[PDB]
Amino acid sequence: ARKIPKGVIHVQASFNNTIVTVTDVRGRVVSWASAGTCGFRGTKRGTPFAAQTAAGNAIRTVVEQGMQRAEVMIKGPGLGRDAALRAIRRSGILLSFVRDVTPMPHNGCRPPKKRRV
Amino acid sequence: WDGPLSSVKLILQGRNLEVSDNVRSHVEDKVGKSVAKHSHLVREVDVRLSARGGDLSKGPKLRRCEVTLFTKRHGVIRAEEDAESLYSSIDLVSSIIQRKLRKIKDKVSDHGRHMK
Amino acid sequence: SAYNVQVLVDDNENEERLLNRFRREVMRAGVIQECKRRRYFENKQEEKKRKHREAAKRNSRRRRG
Amino acid sequence: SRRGTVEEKTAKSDPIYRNRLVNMLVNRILKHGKKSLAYQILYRAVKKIQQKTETNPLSVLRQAIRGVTPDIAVKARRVGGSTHQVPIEIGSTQGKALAIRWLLGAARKRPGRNMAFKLSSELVDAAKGSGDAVRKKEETHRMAEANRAFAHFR
RNA sequence: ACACCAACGGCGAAAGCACUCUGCUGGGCCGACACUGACACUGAGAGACGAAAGCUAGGGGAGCGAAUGGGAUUAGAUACCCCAGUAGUCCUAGCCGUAAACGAUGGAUACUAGGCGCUGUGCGUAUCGACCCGUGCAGUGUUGUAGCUAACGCGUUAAGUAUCCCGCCUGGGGAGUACGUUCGCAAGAAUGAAACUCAAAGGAAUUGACGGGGGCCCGCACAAGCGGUGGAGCAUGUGGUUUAAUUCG
RNA sequence: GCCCGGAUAGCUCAGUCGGUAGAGCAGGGGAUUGAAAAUCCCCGUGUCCUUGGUUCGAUUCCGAGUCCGGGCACCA
Ligand SMILES: [Mg+2]
Ligand SMILES: [Mg+2]
Ligand SMILES: [Mg+2]
Ligand SMILES: [Mg+2]
Ligand SMILES: [Mg+2]
Ligand SMILES: [Mg+2]
Ligand SMILES: [Mg+2]
Ligand SMILES: [Mg+2]
Ligand SMILES: [Mg+2]
Ligand SMILES: [Mg+2]
Ligand SMILES: [Mg+2]
Ligand SMILES: [Mg+2]
Ligand SMILES: [Mg+2]
Ligand SMILES: [Mg+2]
Ligand SMILES: [Mg+2]
Ligand SMILES: [Mg+2]
Ligand SMILES: [Mg+2]
Ligand SMILES: [Mg+2]
Ligand SMILES: [Mg+2]
Ligand SMILES: [Mg+2]
Ligand SMILES: [Mg+2]
Ligand SMILES: [Mg+2]
Ligand SMILES: [Mg+2]
Ligand SMILES: [Mg+2]
Ligand SMILES: [Mg+2]
Ligand SMILES: [Mg+2]
Ligand SMILES: [Mg+2]
Ligand SMILES: [Mg+2]
Ligand SMILES: [Mg+2]
Ligand SMILES: [Mg+2]
Ligand SMILES: [Mg+2]
Ligand SMILES: [Mg+2]
Ligand SMILES: [Mg+2]
Ligand SMILES: [Mg+2]
Ligand SMILES: [Mg+2]
Ligand SMILES: [Mg+2]
Ligand SMILES: [Mg+2]
Fold first, then answer.
1. Closest residue in C to A95 (Cα–Cα)
2. Region class of D102: left (phi > 0), else alpha (psi between -120 and 50), else beta
3. What is the protein's quaternary organization (chain B)?
């Protein structure tokens, strides 16, 4: 739909799922792919493999718009933080910068209590 | 005895002793409670009665009740009790059974998260 | 804009080296351990436990090696 | 098998064709240890397969087993209190084993008259990929790949 | 609410106190003779401070979250888990006065090996300024001699050897309850019995057995195979009933 | 009384701009699981309302008939 030569890839990795969004430097969203939209449900939705197919599935659409260089943003403690990165590499798209944006509060809102499990 | 337990085999065996109607009914009641709640697991109840002492033999008047449970999955629930009256003995065994049972149900059926 | 870890990929790029460089950056800033730590809340006691445990761990790893 | 592993046993050769493979299958076909009967059944199977088609049966073996050999299966693992199907990858000897076994199994279940007829029917159907012993393997793959997410050794 | 700094670090009488800054102010320690010349130590009653929860009045309300509701789990689940979420948590002005308010160790003084540390300072040395070294004090931490202790352990920061003052204990339940008073807006706090009843209740170490605590390792124990039982018919062993007896084990 | 929309697998509805009849559950099977469930995959069934017309032939387009789901009315 839009052919943008350079932009950014946001990958949020949580413990139950990982979102991979494709955007451009103007701060605008083009197309996204989630581990859940790939036909995965809750348990499997956390594994690095679903993050793999998620990243691959977004980059399908990003090469279809004909884009070349990109920055990678990784947010969150989950597993896909490593796995997704591999996909970004093997999908044959030039890797500019890979940053870790995981929000670190400098103090603040008191987190939920400890699960006694 | 129970319908919800109909799937269970209740086997009542006097060893040295003669079984009456009150012993029957009492066995059905006290084993009845024990098993009834945990019925889904339980399979076969084997109760043997052994009397000794008084006029039969030397030593105190002892009546000893042994019970044995099997579950569809786990086997060997063994409960051995010694006491004065048959009734007392049965009450004791039922007290033990209950505990062992709900220990099994506790372990396995808890969705216990066992990581290893 | 803000960032924690900066890995700039050159054109000598192969997958494994990039992946491990990034892995050691995350290990260096201690981020995943940090967000496992702030996942739930800790009383001062578990904080003292974590301080003595981790600090004496890395300190004894410096004094033995 | 907790302590000692297994030493390797001499791989024999079937008397007529000098094969390791044919001897594998005549050993797995065996029942009540009458080799006398097994050799007869298998040789009349070679006879009916050379009757039906003019291709070398020595090759129809390799086509039959290359056809039904699983490269992957699953296994039950207990991981984190969760019971997982984990797609463990299969060794070669185990591959040939499985192969010969589903072949023989689907061969014992056939509608026919003899065992030589059934075995030939199924070698003919597995060498073309046309039958239950290949279908079975492909199901093992279908249920290996649906569960592909649960291998963390990937 | 204050990441990193943060430390087996600093100050505080204790409670507690940490993004940064400035202002008002409390102590502490050290070096000098500059001075007073026993002014000391403790403390019944009495006073002040005193985490968190709680309460009164007024604000404030993001997150968290008693209560409450829904979803599950389970024989049941008024719990653990999840989804929401009210009091409260915050600020001002008060009240309450309790905690495993713990070093489970009242305060002052004197005196009794060391080793390894740290913080603040002082002296000499090193250079002429940062170390550096040796040392004097003041506090703070870890091993350990004498001695002490029922044992564990404590051991110049005593639980050692002595002196002084103060609080408290006198078998376990009954019970930190009742009654009565004092205080409190209330919740309660402080002071604190007796009848009755038991021959025990307790501490420290030891050998076992046990743990849905660890570490190491075996066994056709599981797995991987091959054949069976449970279904059918009969053979037979036992229980049960039956019988004059179905001998007993 | 008018105005719309429907009748399609046992149930619930997707429908080329006429050339194959389809989804999601109910069912059967397999392990999942020591046993439950998730987890997962396979398989079965059709006069596309009844009738005629159009067409090289129709679920598809049109006429009549029948039933069903709703929307809006009126001075015995
Ligand atoms: Mg999870
Ligand atoms: Mg070994
Ligand atoms: Mg101090
Ligand atoms: Mg604080
Ligand atoms: Mg000052
Ligand atoms: Mg004078
Ligand atoms: Mg006083
Ligand atoms: Mg006060
Ligand atoms: Mg408060
Ligand atoms: Mg109230
Ligand atoms: Mg208020
Ligand atoms: Mg709120
Ligand atoms: Mg919440
Ligand atoms: Mg509820
Ligand atoms: Mg409400
Ligand atoms: Mg309920
Ligand atoms: Mg909320
Ligand atoms: Mg106040
Ligand atoms: Mg007190
Ligand atoms: Mg305290
Ligand atoms: Mg030095
Ligand atoms: Mg000192
Ligand atoms: Mg000490
Ligand atoms: Mg010591
Ligand atoms: Mg003492
Ligand atoms: Mg007192
Ligand atoms: Mg007394
Ligand atoms: Mg009053
Ligand atoms: Mg109360
Ligand atoms: Mg007293
Ligand atoms: Mg003890
Ligand atoms: Mg042990
Ligand atoms: Mg053990
Ligand atoms: Mg055995
Ligand atoms: Mg086995
Ligand atoms: Mg039988
Ligand atoms: Mg005798």
1. C9
2. alpha
3. Binds to the mRNA channel of the chloroplast small ribosomal subunit and interacts with 16S sRNA nucleotides at the A-site and P-site.
